[model samples]
Target: MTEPLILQPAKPADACVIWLHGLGADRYDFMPVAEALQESLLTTRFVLPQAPTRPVTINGGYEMPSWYDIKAMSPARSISLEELEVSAKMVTDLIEAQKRTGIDASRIFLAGFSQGGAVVFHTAFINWQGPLGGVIALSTYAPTFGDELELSASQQRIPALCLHGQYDDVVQNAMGRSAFEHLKSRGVTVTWQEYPMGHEVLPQEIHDIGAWLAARLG
Candidate 1:
């Protein structure tokens, strides 16, 4: 796993939060959001991983922080199968290591934004052994659907919130909606919310995210 940016909690913690950043961005991207929630989430450790720098197809192969490679962007999204598989493995060790470090598996929640959110979904379904505290995905889409997903029996028990920006041109609201709809079709109780902004997180969304974390992990 990429060496993570660990944010120590002010108070004693029984849980942890792993937040991933978007494409073209490194581990430092979500520090503001994490810092903003630190006071409210006084008891949970914050873990932000640096996505491996790699070439992206959409940006003409310019190397940037990406969980995987983009092959196409259209009515649907497609990415490198091999890279995604490797990326999933990288995250798996992080979760397992947390357990080894004495943090109960259930107390660890994985979160991400944009391409990072895609990794969160992929890791939860394909690699994680059981339910986590929850999953928080922002402005991202599920890269693959159907047979590609490897959800566990305890997956539905892990509450999830997928928030998107209505005016997002990068991933678009439709992509998020499609992922939300797909997860719902599978009978998962995933919460979906949208804001009237672009492909970015807003103050309202951050506030609500803090509220959600408090209610679930407080």
Candidate 2:
């Protein structure tokens, strides 16, 4: 298993936030964002997990850091579910590690961007069980989410914040919306937020994220 980058808080930590970067990006991709959020999230320890490097079919089989292989890009992205499952398990492992450090599952949050967001969705709603601090999905979609999906009682208690770019052609805006809708339908407390950008995070979005975390873990 790959060792994820851990950002220790300046103060004693009480909560953990495991963040995953998008395709082609490494564990350090979201370092600045984490640092910025730390300004307010004083007691939150940040974990930036690295994706496995593999050949992506859509990119001419070029090897890059990715959670899963994109077999095709069409009405919806065709991805390697097998690889996605592997990544989801990695997330589960990280969560378990945090639990060993004395943080309850309810105090550990999962945040991901783009392809990373897809993994977060799968991990939180499917692979993982019990309560969680919350989830942050940014500029991404749930390609593995099926029409017959069901949630356990504790899974339904996990809150999610799905944020997308209004002009994100990479994953498309509707794709992200559908994931949020499915979570809501399954009785999960989820919120949808859209920005005026394209396939990237905005400063204002970070501000809202910090506020969201503060509300629950401040």
Candidate 3:
């Protein structure tokens, strides 16, 4: 059997929050935040997993979970349909595995940063099997997909909290706004927020994320 993806399991509790790290970072990158979350979220556990590593064409062949290559510096190229589907499948499997551990799918929340955040958005919509607790997408964008590939009719009402930095050079603020608009247009409930920081998460953002999770889990 394939080894379980690198995951930092949370204790059996009221709810679970699967944390997906950004590109170039491992599962450990989000551990610190997970620890902080543990305090505010007494009944909720945080599961941080490492995205499968693969050759990243945009990073001079360095391996990363990067959904796809950007190709250019200023304007990014659209990711291939195949890559998006593959990433979405991986996320779906992870969520299913967690469900088997006694966590209800509706009580499971998804959160990710950068490339991982992109995956969260795609999977939350494309998988079509959720009224998920919610999705927290940080510093990310929704990749371009065909209009026919939109979320299934049954999956239109998932709640989502989108957080982004106003000056994020890596993914840009425009992409974040575009993602929120798209989700809202599709009838999904979405809340978008902008921070003063750059690409990284700020304390206030973390507090906001934790509060959102608390509200939904309750």
Candidate 4:
């Protein structure tokens, strides 16, 4: 498991968020982001877990902060399923840790960017302990969705927000839309938003996300 850079809330950390960063970025990648989103959920604690140093196959095998080894960065061509599951488990462990410290699974949220977002997309739907607040993904695509996907009544109701850059070159805009649509097709409560940018975040995205969190965690 990876040790995380943590930002404890202003008061009681009744709600918690475990955010993951993209490849080549560490836990600190989203430190500033925590403030904007955490504002609405005042008692929310943020955990930015650093990906283990691994030789990313795409960057000429150089060790970098990445969740899994990307054989080739593509829509459905590059993911290592074995590595993906391992990495997903790493995040699930963090959820358990938060539960031990007082935060229930219902009050916990997961957000990730790019590669990190893909991990949490699956993480949010898997065999989690309790009802999670929701999920937010930026410039991300669906990596591994299980066949015969099971959904309890509550599972089908968990909300999800997917944001993408209209001109994203790294991860195509269609990729994000596809994933959100896929979730919606399966009866998951999800919404998709597109920004006039490329492979990055926007102020409006943050504002919209804060509003979504407020309604979601309420």
Each model's lDDT: 0.83, 0.91, 0.77, 0.85
TM-scores, each model vs. reference = 0.93, 0.97, 0.88, 0.93
Tell me the tens digit of each residue's lDDT in model 1 across 9-67. 88876788999898888888899889889988887888888988888998899988888
lDDT pick, better of 2 and 4: 2
Q: What lDDT, from 0 to 1, does candidate 2 have?
A: 0.91
RMSD over all Cα atoms, model 2? 1.1
**Given candidate 3, what's the lDDT at residue 147?**
55
Best by lDDT: 2
Candidate 3 accuracy as lDDT: 0.77
Clashing residue pairs found in predicted model 1: none
Which sequence of candidate numbers ranks them by lDDT, best first? 2, 4, 1, 3
lDDT of 1 at 46: 87
Ranked by TM-score, the better of candidates 1 and 2 is 2
lDDT of 4 by residue, 1-218 (tens): 45898898777789888999998999888999997776666888999999888888888999988888888755447767777787888888888999899888888889999999999987877655467888899999887764566666776766899999999998899878888877888899898899999998898998998888888677
- Candidate 1 residue-wise lDDT at 122: 79
Candidate 3 lDDT over residue span 68-181, tens digit each: 555555554645557767767877887787778777888888888998888888788876476577889999987753355567765676789999999998888998998988
Report clash pairs, candidate 2.
none
Predicted candidate 1: what Cα RMSD to the true structure? 1.8
